[PDB]
Design goal:
Chain lengths: 518, 104, 104
């Protein structure tokens, strides 16, 4: 394997075998030099216009990293359709990673002309953090993924991390990390890199909706043998005290005894899609739903999984309580409503409470002959025995996994942006250009060398994931709901390039179409 | 091993096993040409402002040399902390040296 | 084993082996007679100055019990220092108990 032989081939394919499917993707990347080969302290503090909520302390490194953690990395829109229409669930099993056909290039400036040449003896260096010894920066939903469309070339993002801070300052427990203090592999243009990984057992993502609601599980034809208190007061003659009792039945179903409870609630503020129906004020931050950690307020975004709206409320959404994707060429700041794509969790109404409404009612007081009953409203409810709930849905544009924090305890460790929680997630992959010094002085100086040759590198990357499928077995007589493409004529095809060669994704696509009994 | 293959890998690590610890370090260097490829007589004497205590006679060569003879070459501040808090003594045993990925 | 032979020895030591540490402690105790060999009903109620929150009903026995359930029972301050500076975690595994050299 010299300079004249390729170290790998292009693999983009999908294979559907029985109970599993295997996806494989190849992309072309470009890796710049970051920071001028330097580590740098970064911070932000309230001395400037920053509020206390936004302060941080950390470091930016001279390293890049690979991110394949979105679904459109691994699935074409047609492959995603086969998955969601035919299956009740899926989970990842194992992956392979390859890095090959590396070429390092040097650029030099003379006056205004720029030239690029090959540097055949330069290296890049790569390693995986397989012992989870670095701050794990995947799972924060950052940009810099492998592109959804296989013909696009992408830039590799810069690695950095945060530590503890007090304001803009570091405390005694703050940690610093040098990535050169890790063994890594060095590659010239004829070398290549690969590794394999196995996922730990994780539950299947549930791709389906319930065809029953938690409060409707009864037989509509039969009475219950249990009684409830239907009457505290005599109707006949005057008004007087009595105890009446009735059995629950077809017309009283709201009164019947039940075995189960809806899932937990943390209430969100309601926002209409028609702006004229909203109050006139800027309440996005002040009315936002937050948590409070070490004197510092953080918006709970999206939060726990709750139904977006109830029946015929579709114009409302929770303020910070949903995932929002941008359309192609949308602005970074202050984008309009026509520029973004709002997801809906509406399928989970059958089980989870609605995000913008109360959980229920409890008794505020005890009552007497002289004191009337008082009722409270429950806007926040933690886990109660007998609750059942659904997780948030996953999307073709959304994240796949997250790393579960290493802690004494946790409760239902499913990521709140949606995905698979993992104690040992796929390891993060660090990549860097090796610095090449410019000619030094001819007399010894002990200071470090600050003058380098300008370089960048390009190459190929492949990733292959095996997925396990859960087949749908159902006696439903009538046809299902399916994801489909519009039949009518159009100026362009959805999920294709336009006249200018730009690939766009028209809408977000969820996973829940087939149904199952509750 | 041609121009297109790397002749080594980056090793920086420390390993604590029982009664011993192994350190390994990798750095990047640059080697200039010295003296214009010449050996040169050098001296200093009292004819100038030099006092008799500072006089010398010798030679400068056109060669470089490697120096790893300081402790911070082999230990991170955290590794040095593990050593000095937990142990009554230490001594060196053996070393390995590699020089690789050369480009002129 | 008669009246003139000791039925045990004094063991206070700590041993650090690899991934585990073993602690052992010996103390001298004295056991009185309690209650005059009687079981007794005890209670407290709101009839006196006690509020409803502090009421109880129970029994005191004529028996003693051993309590080693604090950490300073098993660790010297220096042993506790070795533990907390060098380790990310610890848990108990097994214990032994002896009662010996009794004299009434
Ligand atoms: N996505 C994900 N990752 C990891 N762990 C998860 C996830 N979703 C749920 N869980 C946990 C929550 C419970 O401890 C358990 C389910 O118990 P059994 O009755 O199935 O699995």
């Amino acid at each position: 394997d010299g300079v004249g032989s390729s170290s790998g081939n292009w693999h983009c394919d999908s294979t559907w075998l029985g109970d599993r499917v295997i996806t494989t993707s190849t992309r072309t990347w470009a890796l710049p030099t970051y920071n001028n080969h330097l580590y740098k302290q970064i911070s932000n503090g309230t001395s400037g216009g920053a509020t206390n909520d936004n302060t941080y302390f950390g470091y930016s490194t001279p390293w890049g990293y690979f991110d394949f953690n979105r679904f459109h990395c691994h699935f074409s829109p047609r492959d995603w359709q086969r998955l969601i229409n035919n299956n009740w669930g899926f989970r990842p099993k194992r992956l392979s990673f390859k890095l090959f056909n590396i070429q390092v290039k040097e650029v030099t400036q003379n006056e205004g002309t720029k030239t690029i040449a090959n540097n055949l003896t330069s290296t890049i260096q790569v390693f995986t953090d397989s012992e989870y010894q670095l701050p794990y920066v995947l799972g924060s939903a950052h940009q810099g993924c492998l592109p959804p469309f296989p013909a696009d070339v992408f830039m590799i993002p810069q690695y950095g991390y945060l530590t503890l801070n007090n304001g803009s300052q570091a405390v005694g427990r703050s940690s610093f990390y040098c990535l050169e203090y890790f063994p890594s592999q060095m590659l010239r243009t004829g070398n290549n890199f690969q590794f394999t990984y196995t996922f730990e057992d994780v539950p299947f993502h549930s791709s389906y909706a319930h065809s029953q609601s938690l409060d409707r599980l009864m037989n509509p034809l039969i009475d219950q043998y249990l009684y409830y208190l239907s009457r505290t007061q005599t109707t006949s003659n005057g008004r007087g005290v009595t105890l009446g009792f009735s059995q629950g039945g077809p017309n009283t179903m709201a009164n019947q005894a039940k075995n189960w409870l809806p899932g937990p609630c943390y209430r969100q503020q309601r926002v209409s899609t028609y702006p004229l129906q909203n109050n006139n004020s800027n309440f996005a931050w002040t009315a936002g739903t937050k948590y409070h950690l070490n004197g510092r307020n953080s918006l709970a975004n999206p939060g726990i999984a709750m139904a977006t709206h109830k029946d015929d409320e579709e114009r409302f959404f929770p303020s910070n309580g949903i995932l929002i994707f941008g359309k192609q060429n949308a602005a970074r700041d202050n984008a309009d409503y026509s520029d973004v794509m709002l997801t809906s969790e509406e399928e989970i109404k059958t089980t989870n409470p609605v995000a913008t409404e109360e959980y229920g009612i409890v008794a505020d007081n005890g009552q007497t002959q002289t004191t009337a009953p008082q009722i409270g409203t429950v806007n926040s409810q933690g886990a109660l025995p007998g609750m059942v709930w659904q997780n948030r849905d996953v999307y073709l544009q959304g994240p796949i996994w997250a790393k579960i924090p290493h802690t004494d305890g946790n409760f239902h460790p499913s990521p709140l942006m949606g995905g698979f929680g993992l104690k040992h997630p796929p390891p993060q992959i660090l990549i860097k250009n090796t610095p090449v010094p410019a000619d030094p002085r001819s007399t010894f100086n002990g200071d470090k060398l600050n003058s380098f040759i300008t370089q960048y590198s390009t190459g190929q990357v492949s990733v292959e994931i095996e997925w396990e499928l859960q087949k749908e077995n159902s006696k439903r007589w009538n046809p299902e709901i399916q994801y489909t493409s519009n039949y009518y004529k159009s100026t362009s095809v959805d999920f294709a390039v336009n006249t200018e060669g730009v690939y766009s994704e028209p809408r977000p696509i969820g996973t829940r179409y087939l149904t199952r009994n509750l």
